[PDB]
Symmetry: D2
Subunit: 255 residues, 4 copies
């Protein structure tokens, strides 16, 4: 994986603990040119500070809230004018209301359910449509999911249904964009201590059950996700699309 | 497998005699259940009043419920409860997506189209379950209808496939949540059946015929077949089964 | 929920009153089926002659078949055919692995242990199906018993897990092959049940209790619950279902 | 970079073998490679094919995986000759041609268990013996096909053997995880190899991939090799018990 002369858009860095910053450090270390998108002003500030650790000689930062079609459309169009065609997109974006990530899934509100779908699943479809315009000769799109999209995990509740939606999204996008030589895949990351992890009830209980029960008897980190992302975003994974790679110490393979 | 006499089921989503849910109704009715029907469009009520002539139900229990409205789901079930009392389960046979999005390129799906399909085809189960639970104090069974395009990308099913993926996860999270209440939640993954909603899906006839040539039983299924598995899932025969997706599709799920 | 009168089923693998297959037998018997039993060990026949006193079967049809022997399977079914005629289906409840291989380290499994488990626990279905087909000229249903350890690595299930993986693929390939003959083939994935064979699995009690705490219905299943799903799978209720794995396990398959 | 790494590749018969794709990728990335073969003809092919790789020494070992002794003694000797290894690529399977067509229900006991023995059990014993040369961990990769997860017409007994293999990878993953040995599978799409000739309807499947798979094309041996390099390297730390489909997306569609 030399990724020199490649360009990747990484969506969803908030701080140094973000999964997407793991991805960024690995891709940066392999020589990629990187372009970052953020929602909150504070995330841009963190990005300007985190770019000091990377070898990127230019900050390419774009504010994109994926709840707005205009921002996604205009964001990518402007990325295209600033750096040209890209080779792929790492999508590391999700949200649900804290009200809905605990207690009873059956009490989820319509508004909470559709908010989680909108940000955590639909965003991939529209990002893919707009990113395709910058990948005339192909490339690779990777989204971040969690095992709670494949099995009902206590407390993950509405986000689980959104990740089920996301994972089907990857498959329908794979099928649709295949002929354009655009691969679409997911990484199913094991639990990692991030800012968004604080929203999920029982998160610490899960970290520790991974250590005791997963095959490798340890938890994974953001850089491990990043290394599999580099695989999925590079020519190493030619032939792989519509796939869900579990970066979770083997926890998916056990019961 | 003796008998759904003294049982009461709510069947949601009959539009006409070709509806999957009318297969369910004919099987449950024939097994002695009391049945309660919910519909969105006035035309669906008219069809129901005519179809009830074929069933043995001595009383039409018809309730208008558009699952896009919380109020209608809340008030519909509350009124069902006042009219027939506690129920034993719910058959959910409801989905929708815009035709624009069921043939396009999936990557061109609109936000509004995507969320409409989630709202009607997935979220409706969650709120129906929450309101139906109140009429199942001693437990019961909820069954939703899905299709193989929620587990694999099937050409043309597009936005409805992502909605069925969402629905299938919905069944599992509901199973987990309502299990302690002795409410089982399951899905039937029906093979393609000629219905009014089938007309919305591009390439539907091509799929019917590939089932005949390739599925293990070399034939397609019908609405009554779905109904017989629904009776299993809604009865004590399936005690112990929850969070499950039963494929009623001539074995097509098992091949490649 | 009608009737298995005028139907005939072969139930393979009753050893005692706690056998999963005796759950199946009590449900099918209660529904009016004629039943035919096969056993390996002389003690299993003795248990069967005593257990038949509880059933309504007016005639003991008992046949010794060790599924490691082609001759015994071929001659057993041929003789069943001469004694009761055509059958409607087969419940297969047979497995074995050496206790040496059901604990500690899967990587230390012996070739002989591995192939023994495949032979008895998987291949037996294929040859039983081939011989049973001859007694189902107009179609029928075959059901095998599996466990979640065939789909995921469960500690201590080790070699039997690979055998159940093999068995589950077996059901699918058999479904595809025998589908055109209108013979459906399916599996029940039973949750853990206190049986004589359960004693061979390390950590069995630990698993029973984790089901109670974590599975959706917060309780374990029993043999009769397996039997009720078997009646579904062996009857016309499940027309349209083949190549399927129904989990009778309090929903434990659906969680993580 | 796989310099200073050593891998054992099991199951090259000729230049079209999946395992030779693996070899060309690992060789190109600087790995030291060790090869195992069954038939004398495969050794001859290997001595000729090694001329195309950059390996400065042929390390060839005869191992028929039906024999415990040959597996035990093969690996023990590999250890004495090159030292500790970093992983194993297993590309071995067999079933009788009689059983890879017509009716699966007519499969013989001997055919069924032969396919289990060579195509599934071989991984367990290879893993047990390879573990002894991976004191500080490593990676084991086996080759499977979609017919282990769904019933594919004509794949018949080999399908049940791949189902067994795939569960084998998961039980091995669980068991050897604590030893920092990862175990995974690659599910390769159809590739024109010597063993492909034994499967009825193989050409029909190649062409349906081109028309229906997402990428509208078939994969090749080098593509399998590139994902093997991922799985055998530190890039895939955190991944075990997994089945990666290198099949143009065909697994994701119905
Ligand atoms: N940590 C884990 O246990 C784990 C495990 C499996 C999967 N995942 C997935 O990994 C991804 C990244 O999450 P993380 O755990 O790394 O948390 P994180 O650092 O909090 O990153 C989450 C990102 O989502 C972005 N986001 C939320 N709504 C957005 C919107 N409307 N528009 C644009 N961006 C939006 C946030 O940006 P702002 O801060 O600027 O709002 C933030 O950068 C998520 O998809 C998550 O579901 C995480
Ligand atoms: N036939 C098939 O090929 C097939 C295969 C697998 C699964 N399914 C599933 O089977 C279920 C029923 O479809 P079908 O094939 O039976 O078609 P159908 O006869 O057209 O019934 C669909 C029902 O959806 C109802 N509906 C849609 N939106 C609604 C809303 N917002 N509120 C209340 N009801 C609403 C319709 O009621 P109104 O007419 O009153 O609007 C109609 O009764 C669906 O979930 C579908 O996805 C169908
Ligand atoms: N109990 C559980 O937790 C559990 C859970 C999931 C699945 N299962 C499955 O349920 C099935 C029945 O097991 P069980 O728990 O009911 O135990 P069981 O009561 O011990 O019955 C197992 C049967 O296997 C038979 N058997 C073994 N080798 C045989 C052979 N070569 N030929 C003919 N019969 C042979 C035994 O007959 P003889 O005694 O006469 O030798 C015995 O009747 C098995 O497939 C098992 O894998 C059990
Ligand atoms: N080609 C495909 O479409 C495809 C797709 C998915 C999976 N696969 C898998 O890929 C792997 C390699 O197959 P291939 O297609 O590359 O065919 P191949 O080049 O003919 O390789 C198969 C190898 O298996 C070896 N073998 C068989 N029995 C053995 C034994 N008892 N001991 C030691 N070696 C033994 C053969 O050695 P000899 O030459 O000396 O007999 C041969 O080198 C297999 O696991 C196969 O199932 C292939
Ligand atoms: C019970 C499961 C514990 C392991 C869950 C692992 C996990 C951790 C974090 C994940 O990412 C998010 C992102 C946003 C999110 O919603 C949030 C986060 C913070 C505040 C807020 O209001 N909502 C919840 C989880 C994620 O998808 C999955
Ligand atoms: C890829 C073709 C084979 C699969 C089609 C089988 C099938 C047929 C019908 C199904 O149900 C619906 C229900 C509503 C729906 O959306 C519609 C229907 C009519 C008009 C309209 O505007 N939208 C699409 C499918 C369904 O979920 C699945
Ligand atoms: C750690 C798993 C806990 C639940 C296992 C439940 C279970 C219980 C019994 C099962 O059936 C058998 C049948 C034979 C068998 O091998 C035996 C049994 C007794 C003695 C012996 O020498 N071998 C092991 C398990 C089975 O497949 C699964
Ligand atoms: C109908 C599906 C066709 C695509 C199957 C792809 C495939 C191709 C080759 C595969 O590898 C083998 C290896 C040995 C084998 O058994 C053989 C090979 C040659 C001669 C013989 O007697 N048996 C059959 C297939 C394999 O596992 C899978």
């Amino acid at each position: 994986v030399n990724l020199e002369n490649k360009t990747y858009v990484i969506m969803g860095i908030a701080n140094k603990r973000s999964i997407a910053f793991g991805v960024a450090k690995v891709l940066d270390q392999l020589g990629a040119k990187l372009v970052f998108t953020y929602r909150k002003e504070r995330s841009r500030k963190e990005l300007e500070k985190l770019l000091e650790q990377l070898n990127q000689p230019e900050a390419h930062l774009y504010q994109i809230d994926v709840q707005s079609d205009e921002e996604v459309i205009n964001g990518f169009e402007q990325i295209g004018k600033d750096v040209g065609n890209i080779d792929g997109v790492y999508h590391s974006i999700a949200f649900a209301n804290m009200e809905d990530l605990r207690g009873r899934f059956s009490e989820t509100s319509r508004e909470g359910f559709l908010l989680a779908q909108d940000i955590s699943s639909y965003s991939l479809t529209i990002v893919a449509h707009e990113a395709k315009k910058l990948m005339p000769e192909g490339g690779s799109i990777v989204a971040t999911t969690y095992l709670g999209g494949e099995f009902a995990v206590q407390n993950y509740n509405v986000m689980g249904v959104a990740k089920a939606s996301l994972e089907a999204n990857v498959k329908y996008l794979a099928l649709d964009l295949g002929p354009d030589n655009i691969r679409v895949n997911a990484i199913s990351a094991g639990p990692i201590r991030t800012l968004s992890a604080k929203g999920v009830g029982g998160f610490n209980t899960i970290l520790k059950e991974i250590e005791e029960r997963a095959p490798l008897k340890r938890n994974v980190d953001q850089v491990e996700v990043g290394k599999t992302a580099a695989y999925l975003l590079s020519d190493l994974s030619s032939g792989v699309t519509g796939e869900n790679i579990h970066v979770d110490s083997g926890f998916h393979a056990i019961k």
